[PDB]
Paper text:
Lysosomal integral membrane protein 2 (LIMP-2) is encoded by gene SCARB2, and is also known as scavenger receptor class B member 2 (SCARB2; refs 1, 2). It has N- and C-terminal transmembrane helices (being a type III membrane protein) and a heavily glycosylated 400 residue luminal domain (bearing nine potential N-linked glycosylation sites). The most notable function of LIMP-2 is that it serves as a lysosomal sorting receptor for β-glucocerebrosidase (β-GCase), deficiency of which causes Gaucher disease, a lysosomal storage disease in which glucocerebrosides accumulate. LIMP-2 binds to β-GCase in a pH-dependent manner, and dissociation occurs in acidic late endosomal/lysosomal compartments.
Residue numbers in the entry: 37 to 430
């Protein structure tokens, strides 16, 4: 029996959950646009893969408060990124990525949804914008001041003049959670019961699709069996997900089940129709429109290089060469303790883009899902802690 794996003030299980000992790394990879002018004339985009840009994470739980006497527990998962230059392809403060002007594509999308339409329209007309821009890798990630957002900010202070894929994400959390500790049952360990005071979502169609299943992803319940499916709620993905057993792996001396993201997760099916707002009309297998949760921006999540996706997505963008080894999402879990040993959490960020007659900025651009950047959030257990665990286990 292993009731040692429960969150209670005293056990190492708690301390490690509170303050993760193992280092997590995120590597960013960007797609540099080689033929912007030609794309605007309706030609096939060709892109060039650039990276990695490696960041070591700092994690911990804060505002910790036990609930219902040892069964629930509220906390916030802070997270920050420390750049590692010698692990990266170059200096992100100097290196330039040319890609889509996301700020203007966003406000356009807002204008189209009759949000600040005039104000947005007048400014674009006043100050001509380029659809493709060039900025530093650091600017794209952690943010930079944009003309049009600054002009809007003058009138609407609620709207930020800065934009960045990870703007204001360094040293912050993704909201108030209340986790379920193993006290009641070891099965429902580090399981999620609420987020921002809410036990479900509300932006997806079906009650089913709005459910919050599983753990935050950083750990699992002990005594896993190959036959069972494992649910996760990655907040940044804007929906729950499951992973299924792939095969047997060894990480140091420790046994590990390899759980991967199956292709059912983003497949164009009636099951997943409830993710395709408004009227269940999906773009095709292997992508996810997350405009709603990303503040009306035309953001489409997918896997790297449209792996596990419809082929015409891959065909649309020259330079998209997907393969399983490099681009799949996997996680090697010690079946016994439900602890992660090795994992590559991988996914892409794309932008939906189409020609618009009212907006000359769009030129004659093709209708497509435009890949901007993907990443690999990884972890790997070292000898010391491994054999410590391996001896601790027995
Ligand atoms: C990915 O997912 C996302 C989200 O899941 C998808 O987006 C959803 O789908 C589409 C995207 O285009 C979109 O549907 C359209 O919504 C439009 C707007 O809906 C909102 O606004 C409606 C109208 O409100 C204005 O007008 C009303 C009076 O008629 C009035 O009540 C309002 O106050 C408002 O007034 C405006 O005020 C401004 C002035 O402000 P300033 O700028 O400050 O000066 C004026 O400039 C403006 O002209 C106007 O007067 C409202 O009724 C509605 O409830 C929403 O709140 C609609 O316009 C679209 O309607 C279309 O159909 C009509 C049929 O009747 C057609 O005649 C017309 O051509 C029109 O095009 C349509 O419903 C969703 O809004 C959007 N949802 C979200 C949350 O973003 C996205 O598409 C997906 N992408 C992919 C690739 O799959
Ligand atoms: C996200 O957020 C996290 C957490 O905040 C960021 O990580 C931290 O970033 C800060 C700010 O950049 C880092 O501080 C800098 O550290 C560098 C590294 O140099 C090291 O070695 C120096 C030797 O040359 C040493 O002097 C530095 O400081 C040590 O010594 C002092 C006293 O002597 C001691 O008090 C410190 O604790 C250190 O032990 C340092 O370790 C350093 O070069 C920087 O100094 C410059 O910049 C500051 C302004 O920030 C300026 O005042 C100085 O004059 C100098 O110009 C600075 O101190 C910190 O190291 C990071 N923390 C961790 C844990 O890594 C992260 O960068 C953010 N990421 C993103 C993407 O936004
Ligand atoms: C992603 O893709 C983009 C677009 O292709 C690339 O961005 C270009 O990057 C190149 C360099 O890689 C940039 O060119 C460089 O510009 C520097 C500054 O240019 C201004 O200032 C100089 C004076 O120094 C003026 O002469 C010039 O007119 C500009 O106004 C220059 O200093 C560099 O010049 C040196 O280049 C080589 C040696 O490096 C020599 O041949 C030259 O003699 C000279 O010493 C250089 O030309 C260019 O500006 C970028 N374009 C855009 C649109 O931003 C990215 O590189 C690519 N990303 C990655 C990671 O590869
Ligand atoms: C997080 O996620 C990213 C990927 O999204 C990872 O980065 C990749 O890491 C993988 C694994 O190492 C890399 O795959 C390797 O590609 C290399 C290709 O080399 C080129 O140049 C050589 C000449 O030296 C040519 O021979 C070759 O054809 C290529 O043109 C190779 O070094 C590797 O090939 C060897 O291993 C593979 C095993 O799969 C064998 O198939 C080969 O025969 C050979 O033995 C390998 O293919 C990939 O390139 C990386 N990509 C990027 C963009 O960095 C991170 O590593 C990952 N995980 C973590 C924890 O960070
Ligand atoms: C999050 O929660 C649940 C549980 O994982 C997921 O819904 C489940 O989906 C399956 C279909 O594959 C359901 O099977 C059903 O069985 C019932 C009972 O016999 C039957 O009434 C149905 O016709 C169907 O056969 C399963 O029961 C269902 N769970 C519940 C509680 O109804 C859901 O999809 C997950 N969502 C996300 C976003 O991860
Ligand atoms: C997503 O799936 C839907 C339905 O599962 C597909 O729509 C079908 O399209 C064929 C012709 O290609 C029609 O004969 C069917 O009647 C359609 N069915 C429904 C329910 O609409 C569609 O092909 C898929 N979408 C994409 C973009 O490939
Ligand atoms: C738990 O540890 C001890 C229990 O006595 C106490 O000093 C401390 O305040 C508690 N901290 C948290 C985060 O629960
Ligand atoms: C988790 O604990 C048990 C284990 O299966 C389950 O019966 C129960 O419904 C769960 N608890 C809560 C509060 O949801
Ligand atoms: Cl290993």
């Amino acid at each position: 029996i292993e009731k040692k794996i429960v969150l209670r003030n005293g056990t190492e299980a708690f301390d490690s959950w509170e303050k993760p000992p193992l280092p997590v790394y995120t590597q960013f990879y960007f797609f540099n646009v080689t033929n912007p002018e030609e794309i605007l004339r309706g030609e096939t985009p060709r892109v060039e893969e650039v990276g990695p840009y490696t960041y070591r994470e700092l994690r911990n739980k804060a505002n910790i408060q036990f609930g219902d006497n040892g069964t629930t527990i509220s906390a916030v998962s802070n997270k920050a990124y420390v750049f590692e230059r010698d692990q990266s392809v170059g200096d992100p403060k100097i290196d330039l990525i040319r890609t889509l002007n996301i700020p203007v594509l966003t406000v356009i999308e807002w204008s189209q949804v009759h949000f600040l339409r005039e104000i947005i329209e007048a400014m674009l007309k006043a100050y001509q914008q380029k659809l493709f821009v060039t900025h530093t890798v650091d600017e794209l990630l952690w943010g930079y001041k944009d003309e049009i957002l600054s002009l809007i900010h003058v009138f609407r202070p609620d709207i930020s003049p800065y934009f960045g894929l990870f703007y204001e994400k360094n040293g912050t959390n993704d909201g108030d959670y209340v986790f379920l500790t193993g006290e009641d049952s070891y099965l429902n360990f580090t399981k999620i019961v609420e987020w921002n005071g809410k036990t479900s979502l509300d932006w997806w169609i079906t009650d089913k699709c709005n459910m919050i299943n599983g753990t935050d992803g950083d750990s699992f319940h002990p005594l896993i069996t190959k036959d069972e499916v494992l649910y996760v709620f990655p907040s940044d993905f804007c929906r729950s997900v499951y992973i299924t057993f792939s095969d047997y792996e060894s990480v140091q001396g420790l046994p590990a089940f390899r759980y991967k993201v199956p292709a059912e997760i983003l497949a164009n099916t009636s099951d997943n129709a409830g993710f395709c707002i408004p009227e269940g009309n999906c773009l095709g297998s292997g992508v996810l429109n997350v405009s709603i949760c990303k503040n009306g921006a035309p953001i489409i999540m997918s896997f790297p290089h449209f792996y596990q996706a419809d082929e015409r997505f891959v065909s649309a963008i020259e330079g998209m060469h997907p393969n399983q080894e490099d681009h799949e999402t996997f996680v090697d879990i010690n079946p016994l303790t439900g602890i992660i040993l090795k994992a590559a959490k991988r996914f892409q960020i794309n932008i939906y883009v189409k020609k618009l007659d009212d907006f000359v900025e769009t030129g004659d651009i093709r209708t497509m899902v435009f890949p901007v950047m993907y990443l690999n959030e990884s972890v790997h257990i070292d000898k010391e802690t491994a054999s410590r665990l391996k001896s601790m286990i027995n």
